[PDB]
Design a protein around this ligand. Structure first.
Ligand SMILES: CCCCCCCCCCCCCCCCCC(=O)OC[C@H](COP(=O)([O-])OCC(O)COP(=O)([O-])OC[C@@H](COC(=O)CCCCCCCCCCCCCCCCC)OC(=O)CCCCCCCCCCCCCCCCC)OC(=O)CCCCCCCCCCCCCCCCC
Ligand SMILES: CCCCCCCCCCCCCCCCCC(=O)OC[C@H](COP(=O)([O-])OCC(O)COP(=O)([O-])OC[C@@H](COC(=O)CCCCCCCCCCCCCCCCC)OC(=O)CCCCCCCCCCCCCCCCC)OC(=O)CCCCCCCCCCCCCCCCC
Ligand SMILES: CCCCCCCCCCCCCCCCCC(=O)OC[C@H](COP(=O)([O-])OCC(O)COP(=O)([O-])OC[C@@H](COC(=O)CCCCCCCCCCCCCCCCC)OC(=O)CCCCCCCCCCCCCCCCC)OC(=O)CCCCCCCCCCCCCCCCC
Ligand SMILES: CCCCCCCCCCCCCCCCC[C@@H](O)O[C@H](CO[C@H](O)CCCCCCCCCCCCCCC)COP(=O)(O)OCC[N+](C)(C)C
Ligand SMILES: CCCCCCCC/C=C\CCCCCCCC(=O)OC[C@H](COP(=O)(O)OCCN)OC(=O)CCCCCCC/C=C\CCCCCCCC
Ligand SMILES: CCCCCCCC/C=C\CCCCCCCC(=O)OC[C@H](COP(=O)(O)OCCN)OC(=O)CCCCCCC/C=C\CCCCCCCC
Ligand SMILES: CCCCCCCCCCCCCCCCCC(=O)OC[C@H](COP(=O)(O)OCCN)OC(=O)CCCCCCCCCCCCCCCCC
Ligand SMILES: Nc1ncnc2c1ncn2[C@@H]1O[C@H](COP(=O)(O)OP(=O)(O)O)[C@@H](O)[C@H]1O
Lengths: 321, 98, 459, 347, 54, 99, 54, 49
């Protein structure tokens, strides 16, 4: 043992034995600038679950090396502020941002599943890979991205998200678009103040017409308004009194759980199909730029060698490690 | 050699030609594969009984055992192919190319 | 020979362990020291070779080639440090490693005492060269050039391997001394004809022979400066050395089998000189000049007289030095203007005086100008060919005239005339470039002073 | 599939091969073949998908036909001699049946199609085990029965194998199909030298196994199954591409790499027996294998193909699983030419 | 330069050989992956090896 | 565009930062010492020392030995009336021709 | 002023189903990324039976 | 502490280090003893010393 694998499995570590029937995956969803973050915080703290804030850019930075984020040129090469300012850029920033955000959400979902399977403690994600496509549809129907971008996104999403268990609970916070705009104006951030009304309507249409009907068949779906979402006590009470046996989690066994844990503990296999040789001009990076940026990344302080073997960050006994 | 051995060897050759020439069904090929081992069984027992090789009389039984092991393997593969495609046709096994 | 082999295998860890800014200094200094040490091999005997051990031996034919290789390594280092300034430290060290490996393989190739060990080493020299070309070349055609070079050489050399193992099974040994002492005449039969063909064709492709030479322009044009320097200076001499070695056992069949190769070599010498007359690319012009000179060397080896072998060795050394110098000069011009076209840059004599002097000296040596060793070798080959037949003088005279024509045409086009008006980035010549040209040219004149050191064993 | 079931199936495959290699009885050899095939099918079908199912179906059909022909040869040999011991076969018809059956098991031409098809169908681990072990066993049988092999038939099949491997590898782009055609060519070389020196056959087998293990494990490490997927590896782990380049050069037979030693020794041995045309043709035809190795090497290491944007996240993460004996395989497949006279120890 | 070097010396040795190898490779690797077809091929090979090799 | 590619960088001139540049390295000290070691070792050591060493290499080719031997043989043979150049390399008494 | 490196044109040359495409091979398509083909819409066609009236 | 997560190879596995050093030392001393025994047996069999 000493590391999960086939040896640990034949020794007898079993996920079903580890779980305590309170191990649930709960994902909170909503339109832009809703109370989903605070609702997720409340649910995670009341149920004793681990909270996962929405995976923006630099989530991979937060989970690797030191927690501090990296330069945007080295982590993402995309800008949400620039997307708000000039959505129809000529450098493909919109779809670069969308693909990077999908990869980050996939990585966060893998981390959450690994934590749940290795600990048995439930997790509350502020968004999942199953809700990421709504922003893609909003971009596409507004003309920000292209049909080729949509097709590449669909291919990667297929071959990646087909291998993971869906959330137990999907909590959707329904807020009207004018209220969304009023809250955005009150917040006062200029970049999100540049958001148009047609963009916000497309996200709501994608949630209502595709995501909620799709996830209603799998397991339980709970919808709340702003007032209902404000009172998190009733939401946690509703979660605690959910009866469901039609999900894939009951159908899972120890062998399937072993396979899933082996998949999710290996982050490079998680991201394996995120870099497929589909040469969209938006995401494709030339040989010279790739070489220069990779050289810079290796020149980063604790990135040249493996984590235990970086002398400049204060690792000793390297000659015996 | 008597004509009996000639007939048994001819039957084996006919069964071998049947297997190598598919028509539509994979099941018919499995039947041809089972016939080849029947001919091998008959030939081996005819040879052993004629020379009074007493200890070799257990060989045809082992032949039968591994014959039906192969038949079991073929039936399992056939059910998986049928589950995938709807029919046991050999034309559907064309995804991989040389 | 271990006193020369081991310091190269120590150049390897030193290069990989030195600091990021000391790699060029260390490699250059210790390569020069190794060259100085290898100068001691020129003290040869008049009777036999220098038999160091059962594995390595040195002769009057091997010694100058080893000295040329060891002297050529630091010059390649200087040119490489010119054009690889922005490379990463690991890739610089890999480049130096490829150069060091190539030098080690060449040294062991020239000093090998068995034909099979010679084959293994002279085929091992392809890997560093191919990696260098197809990895650090500038243009797109480097991949096709590497493929052409590799497959020409291997298609030539595989029948040589079969013939060598057959000869060992037949006679008992591939040791050069044994096969020289136990040599027997080769009867005129189809089997002997095809054995002769296998060996000779391997080395003729390596030479190259006219009609088997396209890989040479492809590879020399598209390789980096170090690759071009080693390809012309040394790697073309493996074919000549091999032919001067293997023809011990191919007599008397060489008297009858040499006609197609002699006709090909003479006519192709004329043809490649004429091609040089009408070339729009400077590197291609230099490459075809190399083809012409090696065709002359092939003629010398095939006629196979004591006066021709001395000429062959002298011409090989002289061509190595001259072609290396010409490639370096063309590369300096290319680094100025980032193009290989000959008529793009002109007036370089009024913009760069000392480089004009270097161009003049190199072009004068490229044609046979007395008393240079180029002329010594060419004159010996011409005299032996005249004793062979009396129309070879006609062909050689035509070749000399065209050689002078294209050499002086290249000089006049690049240096004389009026400067191109819009080319305003021609900075003054670097001390490094001037020192490189000096180190190319001074040893050639010293060899002219002492010519018995490069005339081979037949002297 | 449960880990215990997988390891017992692997143990059963190895037990079948060992039974083949230790048995002195034809019935026990056939039993070993049957056990190997029976335990090998689920290993192919481990990762369930229609391609794996089709590959396993084709593999089963081919191997079952070969086993039927082999048992027919055994029975025919018993008919004319009454001997069960595996020695020189006493009937030429039985020997021809046995030779064709073992060639079909090995994948020698014209029985080669199933090799690229199955290799493309199955995963990288399954392909590695398939190539290595399933070449290992029938070659042992052939070495035992070598002295009665028809040289004409064996050399014809070997030369066909070399030619077909070269041409198929020329056309292919998928890495698994490239490896399959490489395997076909190497099997051709081994069986070509088989009727003369089983020691040289074993040496070629060992060098081929080492090179194939190194190459397949590098592909598993980089998670590349196509050429373009392998073209992105320079931007994540450039060392793997360098090692793959030197291994590819070794597999092409370039000196002084380890892949030159089997070709050299085989040519020498064949020339000792007054074979010249066959060694020359075999040596010249390997240039096709070298061409598609070089074409694969241009994309991976010697040139830099465009990369994507998520490669930055891949940079941020580190490889977890450690390949066993990968450095040893890489060293043994490139730097063992000076240790050539150990083939006498292998004798 | 044009007629001989760039055209005919290219056509005779390297171009013709490359074209032949490419055509043969296309012929060999252009298979539909049908067990019926290559098992019929196996039958033909068995018949030929039985009859022509004695 | 079809890629996110860097613009082609401008040519870097060593004379701009370092007017007295030898063209070896960007760092002035490393460049100066590279020039010094190259010039010293190459020109001085290799050129001068190797040239004088080659000039004064011992006469191992036996040129002067052969000349002295030929002088002695010519003197002896013309003193005794023998031909200066012997007609045969070997001894016909020791050579046995076929019947 | 910089060394040439492969671009999308070169990569797309190397990214087909096979090298040297023909008509049939161009009709062919590269395999799926994870080797899992999309499932086919086979019809179950359950047996329909009249249970009664006789 | 620099890494947000403890690296798996944070500190040397002293069990593995001790096993590695012990295995190397055992193999070396065994090889020396085997060579000495081989030399003695060769000399005894050939009647040299
Ligand atoms: C009986 C007593 C011993 C029992 C040992 C196993 C039980 C304990 C461990 C355990 O639970 O293992 C489960 C574990 C299965 O766990 P899993 O999560 O299903 O992993 C699936 C894949 O292995 C996941 O893929 P992977 O990346 O883990 O691949 C592992 C494996 C995948 O490859 C194989 O399994 C093939 C192994 C044979 C390779 C060919 C060797 C050829 C040698 C030729 C002759 C040379 C002389 O090996 C390789 O990839 C590289 C193999 C290099 C072999 C070098 C041999 C040199 C000699 O079993 C194995 O990994 C294989 C066990 C094989 C046992 C037989 C003896 C070997
Ligand atoms: C085509 C027309 C033709 O025959 O042109 C010959 C002609 C050779 O010059 P030549 O002065 O007419 O030959 C003198 C006598 O005709 C022939 O000389 P000989 O009658 O006094 O006896 C010597 C003869 C003894 O005769 C034989 O050995 C004939 C038996 C078959 C020889 C097969 C040679 C295979 C090896 C070379 C493969 C590549 C070619 O030697 C050869 O045949 C030497 C064979 C190799 C010739 C040159 C190979 C390199 C060609 C480079 C350009 C390729 C484009 O041109 C070529 O061989 C190259 C162009 C045609 C290809
Ligand atoms: C050896 C010297 C190598 C010098 C390399 C360049 C050095 C340099 O940077 O110089 C610029 C530097 C200052 O110039 P600057 O104005 O500041 O710079 C701006 C321009 O670069 C200024 O450019 P420039 O145009 O003023 O350049 C000066 C000179 C720079 O160019 C040369 O020096 C070219 C020399 C190489 C020619 C290559 C083809 C021929 C190969 C012959 C090999 C003989 C080896 C003898 C031993 C040499 C040992 C090193 O160019 C010429 O004079 C034009 C070419 C004339 C060639 C005439 C050859 C006729 C045959 C001679 C045969 C002698 C030996 C056999 C005798 C048998 C009977 C006793 O000038 C010097 O240091 C003067 C060096 C000597 C120049 C004349 C060379 C005469 C050669 C012998 C002729 C016979 C008479 C005896 C003379 C004894 C002394
Ligand atoms: C009028 C025109 C005159 C123009 C030329 C004037 C040049 C000055 C006059 C000549 C110099 C005075 C004579 C010097 C000459 O005698 O020395 C030569 C010797 O020069 C050197 O040997 C040349 C060395 C060449 C080797 C250089 C090695 C440096 C490294 C180069 C590496 C690259 C080499 C690649 C190929 C090997 C010839 O040998 P030798 O006259 O009897 O020596 C006399 C001493 N003895 C009596 C004891 C024998
Ligand atoms: C298409 C037509 C190709 C023609 C060119 C030949 C290249 C294909 C090589 C195939 C072999 C053909 C020649 C076979 C010669 C041969 O085997 O005999 C040589 C002889 C056989 O003697 P025995 O068998 O012992 O007979 C005993 C008599 N009592 O063996 C030897 O001497 C060793 C010779 C090695 C074989 C050499 C074959 C190659 C000949 C030259 C071709 C190479 C040219 C290089 C190509 C570069 C330019 C394209
Ligand atoms: C019966 C025995 C004979 C069987 C065959 C013996 C083989 C003899 C030697 C074969 C040489 C092997 C190299 C040729 C392999 C095939 C080359 C080929 O495929 O040509 C196509 C190729 C382009 O296609 P790809 O690069 O694959 O990519 C296409 C992207 N759209 O064309 C080329 O320009 C490449 C050619 C390779 C370099 C030229 C070969 C070098 C010269 C070969 C003969 C040498 C002469 C001997 C001296
Ligand atoms: C006959 C035995 C064959 C090998 C059996 C074991 C194979 C699996 C183990 C090696 C895995 C790959 C190497 C890298 C391991 C990295 C993990 C690590 O830290 O390993 C530490 C380990 C030493 O730990 P320790 O347990 O002490 O090992 C000796 C046994 N007590 O350090 C190592 O393991 C590294 C050194 C391993 C030994 C040298 C490499 C193997 C080859 C031995 C020589 C034979 C060469 C020819 C091989 C083919 C022909 C037999
Ligand atoms: N797939 C996506 N594409 C573009 N922008 C996204 C995507 N996912 C999230 N974002 C941005 O990230 C931010 C998420 O925060 P938000 O949903 O507003 O919650 P909060 O109100 O707590 O900030 C939003 O500004 C949204 O525009």
């Amino acid at each position: 043992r000493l590391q999960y694998g086939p040896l640990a499995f034949v020794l007898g570590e079993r996920t079903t034995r580890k779980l305590t029937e309170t191990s649930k995956v709960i994902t909170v969803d909503g339109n832009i600038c809703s109370g989903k973050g605070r609702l997720a915080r409340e649910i995670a703290e009341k149920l004793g679950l681990r909270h996962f804030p929405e995976a923006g850019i630099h989530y991979a930075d937060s989970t690797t090396g030191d927690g501090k984020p990296l330069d945007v040129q080295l982590s993402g090469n995309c800008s949400l502020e620039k997307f708000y300012d000039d959505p129809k850029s000529n450098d493909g920033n919109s779809y670069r941002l969308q693909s990077w955000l999908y990869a980050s959400r996939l990585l966060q979902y893998a981390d959450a599943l690994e934590h749940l399977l290795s600990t048995g403690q439930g997790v509350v994600l502020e968004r999942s890979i199953y809700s990421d496509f709504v922003f893609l549809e909003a971009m596409y129907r507004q003309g920000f991205i292209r049909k080729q971008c949509v097709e590449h996104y669909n291919e990667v999403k297929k071959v990646t998200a087909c291998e993971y268990l869906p959330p137990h609970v999907v909590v959707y916070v329904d807020v009207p678009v004018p209220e969304i705009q009023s809250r955005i104006q009150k917040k006062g951030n200029p970049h999100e103040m540049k958001i148009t009304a047609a963009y916000l309507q497309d996200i709501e249409n994608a949630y209502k017409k595709t995501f909620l009907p799709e996830m209603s068949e799998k397991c339980e779906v709970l919808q709340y308004s702003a007032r209902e979402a404000e009172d998190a006590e009733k939401v946690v009470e509703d979660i605690e009194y959910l009866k469901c046996d039609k999900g894939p989690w009951p159908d899972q066994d120890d062998r399937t759980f072993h396979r899933l844990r082996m998949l999710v503990q290996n982050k490079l296999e998680v991201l394996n199909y995120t870099t497929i040789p589909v040469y969209l001009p938006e995401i494709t990076i030339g040989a010279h730029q790739s070489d220069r940026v990779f050289q810079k990344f290796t020149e980063l302080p604790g990135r040249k060698y493996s984590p235990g073997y970086n002398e400049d960050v204060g690792d000793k006994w390297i000659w015996l490690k | 050699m008597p004509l009996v051995y000639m007939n048994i060897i001819m039957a084996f050759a006919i069964a071998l030609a049947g297997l190598l020439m598919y028509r539509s069904h994979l099941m018919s090929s499995l039947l041809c594969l089972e016939g080849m081992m029947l001919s091998l069984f008959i030939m081996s027992t005819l040879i052993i009984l004629n020379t009074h090789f007493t200890l070799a009389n257990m060989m045809p039984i082992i032949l039968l055992v591994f014959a039906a092991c192969e038949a079991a393997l073929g039936l399992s593969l056939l059910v998986m192919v049928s589950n995938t495609y709807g029919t046991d046709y050999v034309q559907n096994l064309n995804l991989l190319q040389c | 020979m271990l006193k020369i082999i081991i310091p190269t295998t120590m150049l390897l860890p030193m290069t990989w362990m030195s600091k990021h800014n000391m790699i060029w200094i260390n490699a250059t200094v210790h390569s020069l020291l190794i060259s100085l040490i290898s100068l001691s091999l020129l003290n040869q005997l008049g009777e036999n070779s220098l038999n160091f051990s059962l594995t390595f031996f040195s002769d009057s034919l091997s010694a100058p080639l080893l000295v040329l290789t060891t002297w050529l390594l630091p010059l390649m280092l200087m040119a490489s440090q010119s054009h690889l300034s922005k490379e990463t430290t690991t890739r610089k060290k890999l480049y130096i490693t490829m150069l060091i490996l190539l030098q080690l393989f060449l040294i062991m190739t020239f000093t090998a005492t068995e034909l099979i060990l010679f084959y293994i080493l002279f085929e091992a020299t392809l890997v560093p060269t191919l990696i260098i070309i197809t990895r650090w070349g500038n243009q797109t055609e480097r991949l096709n050039a590497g493929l052409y070079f590799l497959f020409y050489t291997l298609a030539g050399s595989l029948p040589l391997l079969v013939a060598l193992v057959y000869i060992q099974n037949t006679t008992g040994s591939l040791n050069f001394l044994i096969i020289h002492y136990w040599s027997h005449p080769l009867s005129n039969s189809w089997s002997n004809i095809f054995m002769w063909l296998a060996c000779i064709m391997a080395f003729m492709v390596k030479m190259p022979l006219y009609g088997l030479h396209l890989w040479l322009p492809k590879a020399h044009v598209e390789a980096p400066i170090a690759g071009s320097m080693v390809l012309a200076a040394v790697l073309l001499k493996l074919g000549g050395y091999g032919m001067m070695r293997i023809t011990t056992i191919l007599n008397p069949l060489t008297n009858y089998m040499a006609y197609p190769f002699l006709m090909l070599s003479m006519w192709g010498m004329i043809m490649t000189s004429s091609i040089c007359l009408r070339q729009t690319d400077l590197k291609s012009l230099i490459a075809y000049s190399s083809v012409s000179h090696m065709a002359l060397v092939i003629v010398a080896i095939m006629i196979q007289t004591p006066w021709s072998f001395m000429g062959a060795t002298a011409l090989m050394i002289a061509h190595g030095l001259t072609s290396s110098m010409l490639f370096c000069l063309a590369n300096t011009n290319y680094e100025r203007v980032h193009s290989r076209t000959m008529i793009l840059a002109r007036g370089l004599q009024t913009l760069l005086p000392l480089m004009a002097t270097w161009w003049l000296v190199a072009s004068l040596t490229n044609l046979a100008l007395p008393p240079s060793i180029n002329l010594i070798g060419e004159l010996f080959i011409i005299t032996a060919s005249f004793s062979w037949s009396n129309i070879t003088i006609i062909l050689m005279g035509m070749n000399m005239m065209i050689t002078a024509l294209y050499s002086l045409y290249m000089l006049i086009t690049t240096q004389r005339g009026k400067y191109t008006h819009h080319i305003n980035n021609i900075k003054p010549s670097f001390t490094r470039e001037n020192a490189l040209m000096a180190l190319h040219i001074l040893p050639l004149l010293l060899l002219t002073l002492n010519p018995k050191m490069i005339l081979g064993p037949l002297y | 599939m449960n880990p215990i079931i997988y390891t017992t199936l692997i143990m059963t495959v190895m037990s079948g091969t060992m039974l083949v290699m230790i048995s002195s009885h034809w019935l026990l050899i056939w039993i070993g073949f049957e056990m190997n095939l029976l335990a090998m099918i689920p290993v192919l079908m481990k990762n369930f998908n229609p391609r794996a199912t089709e590959a396993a179906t084709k593999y089963f059909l081919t191997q079952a036909t070969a086993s039927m022909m082999l048992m027919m040869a055994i029975i025919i040999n018993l008919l004319y001699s009454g001997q069960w011991t595996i020695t020189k076969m006493f009937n030429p018809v039985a020997m021809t049946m046995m030779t064709m059956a073992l060639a079909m098991k090995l994948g020698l031409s014209p029985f080669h199609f199933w090799v690229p098809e199955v290799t493309q169908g199955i995963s990288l681990q399954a392909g590695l085990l398939l190539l290595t072990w399933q070449k290992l066993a029938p070659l042992s049988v052939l070495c035992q029965i070598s002295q009665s092999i028809n040289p004409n038939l064996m050399l014809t099949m070997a030369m066909l194998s070399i030619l077909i491997g070269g041409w198929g590898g020329l056309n292919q782009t998928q890495l698994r199909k490239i490896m399959a055609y490489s395997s076909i060519a190497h099997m051709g070389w081994m069986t070509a030298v088989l009727p003369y020196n089983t020691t040289m056959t074993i040496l070629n087998l060992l060098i081929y196994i080492t090179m194939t293990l190194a190459m397949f494990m590098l592909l598993i490490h980089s998670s590349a199954t196509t050429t373009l997927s392998l073209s992105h590896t320079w931007n994540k782990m450039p060392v793997i591409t360098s090692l793959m380049m030197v291994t590819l050069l070794s597999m092409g037979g370039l000196p002084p790499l380890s892949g030159f030693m089997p070709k050299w020794m085989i040519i020498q041995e064949m020339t000792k027996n007054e074979s010249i045309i066959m060694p020359t043709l075999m040596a010249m035809t390997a240039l096709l294998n070298l061409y598609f190795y070089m074409r694969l090497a241009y994309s991976s290491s010697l040139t830099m193909f465009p990369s994507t944007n998520n490669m930055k996240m891949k940079w941020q993460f580190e490889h977890t699983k450690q390949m066993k004996l990968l450095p040893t395989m890489i060293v043994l497949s490139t730097l063992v030419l000076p240790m050539t006279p150990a083939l006498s120890s292998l004798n | 330069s044009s007629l001989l070097d760039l055209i005919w010396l290219e056509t005779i040795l390297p171009k013709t050989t490359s074209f032949i190898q490419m055509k043969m490779s296309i012929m060999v690797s252009n298979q539909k992956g049908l067990i019926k077809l290559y098992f019929l091929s196996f039958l033909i090979t068995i018949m030929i090896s039985m009859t022509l090799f004695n | 565009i079809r890629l996110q590619e860097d613009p082609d960088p401008e040519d870097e001139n060593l004379y701009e930062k370092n007017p007295d540049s030898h063209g070896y390295d960007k760092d002035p000290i490393v460049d100066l010492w590279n020039m010094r070691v190259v010039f010293f070792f190459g020109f001085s050591i290799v050129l001068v020392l190797g040239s004088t060493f080659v000039a004064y290499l011992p006469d191992y080719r036996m040129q002067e030995w052969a000349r002295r031997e030929a002088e002695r043989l010519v003197k002896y043979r013309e003193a005794n009336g023998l031909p200066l150049m012997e007609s045969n390399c070997f001894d016909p008494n020791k050579i046995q021709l076929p019947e | 002023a910089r060394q040439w490196q492969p671009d999308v044109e070169w990569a797309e040359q190397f990214g087909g189903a096979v090298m040297y495409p023909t008509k049939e091979t161009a009709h062919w398509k590269p395999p799926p990324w994870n080797d899992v083909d999309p499932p086919k819409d086979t019809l179950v066609s359950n047996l329909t039976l009249n249970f009664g009236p006789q | 502490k620099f890494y947000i997560r403890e690296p798996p190879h944070g500190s040397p596995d002293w069990l593995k280090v001790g096993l590695t050093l012990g295995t190397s030392v055992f193999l070396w001393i065994y090889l020396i003893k085997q060579h000495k025994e081989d030399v003695l047996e060769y000399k005894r069999r050939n009647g040299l010393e």
